[PDB]
Design an enzyme around this catalytic site. Structure first.
Site, PDB file in Angstrom:
ATOM      1  N   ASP A   1      14.507 -15.694  45.522  1.00  0.00           N
ATOM      2  CA  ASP A   1      14.810 -16.197  44.621  1.00  0.00           C
ATOM      3  C   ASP A   1      13.825 -15.043  42.881  1.00  0.00           C
ATOM      4  O   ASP A   1      14.744 -15.181  42.449  1.00  0.00           O
ATOM      5  CB  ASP A   1      15.058 -17.706  43.749  1.00  0.00           C
ATOM      6  CG  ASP A   1      13.360 -18.310  44.235  1.00  0.00           C
ATOM      7  OD1 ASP A   1      11.991 -17.560  43.594  1.00  0.00           O
ATOM      8  OD2 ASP A   1      13.389 -19.495  43.272  1.00  0.00           O
TER       9      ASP A   1
ATOM     10  N   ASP B   1       4.510 -17.686  44.707  1.00  0.00           N
ATOM     11  CA  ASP B   1       3.627 -19.325  44.886  1.00  0.00           C
ATOM     12  C   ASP B   1       2.349 -18.291  45.182  1.00  0.00           C
ATOM     13  O   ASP B   1       1.863 -17.368  45.609  1.00  0.00           O
ATOM     14  CB  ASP B   1       3.993 -19.453  46.210  1.00  0.00           C
ATOM     15  CG  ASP B   1       5.745 -20.679  46.453  1.00  0.00           C
ATOM     16  OD1 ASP B   1       6.450 -20.782  45.840  1.00  0.00           O
ATOM     17  OD2 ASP B   1       5.587 -20.090  48.271  1.00  0.00           O
TER      18      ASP B   1
END
Ligand SMILES: [Cl-]
Ligand SMILES: [Rb+]
Length: 129
Positions: A48, A52
């Site tokens: 997307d 992280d």
């Protein structure tokens, strides 16, 4: 910083994560193991476009600001780089917010898939805590 197993357990306990929202220390250690292999500098890009960061792979869409993620909310009010520090305070503070968001530790898909329901106490076995 690459933490040792018991070293991280002790640091997580020292920062109030043991039994936080009812999740025993082994749960947190198990989540860190599969998210980052205990490496505070771990980063991983998602499909997307978010990324992280850190020992618990905290995402840049909802939780931290990395300046390159469309629709970022920065709900922990931190730069994502703070989550890469040798000092885990920022990651722990933000993880407390994440685990309080409604779905408990299921927020960490790796925790659901690899730690949930298992003998997580093994992750702290042997440790002087
Ligand atoms: Cl819960
Ligand atoms: Rb914010």
């Amino acid at each position: 910083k690459v933490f040792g197993r018991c070293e991280l357990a002790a640091a997580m306990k020292r920062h109030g994560l043991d039994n936080y929202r009812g999740y025993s220390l082994g749960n947190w250690v198990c989540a860190a193991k599969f998210e980052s292999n205990f490496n505070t500098q771990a980063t991983n890009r998602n499909t997307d476009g978010s990324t992280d960061y850190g020992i618990l792979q905290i995402n840049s869409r909802w939780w931290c600001n990395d300046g390159r993620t469309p629709g970022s909310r920065n709900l922990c009010n931190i730069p994502c780089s703070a989550l890469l520090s040798s000092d885990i305070t920022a990651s722990v503070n933000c993880a407390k917010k994440i685990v309080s968001d409604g779905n408990g530790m299921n927020a960490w898909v790796a925790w659901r898939n690899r730690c949930k329901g298992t003998d997580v106490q093994a992750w702290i076995r042997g440790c002087r805590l």
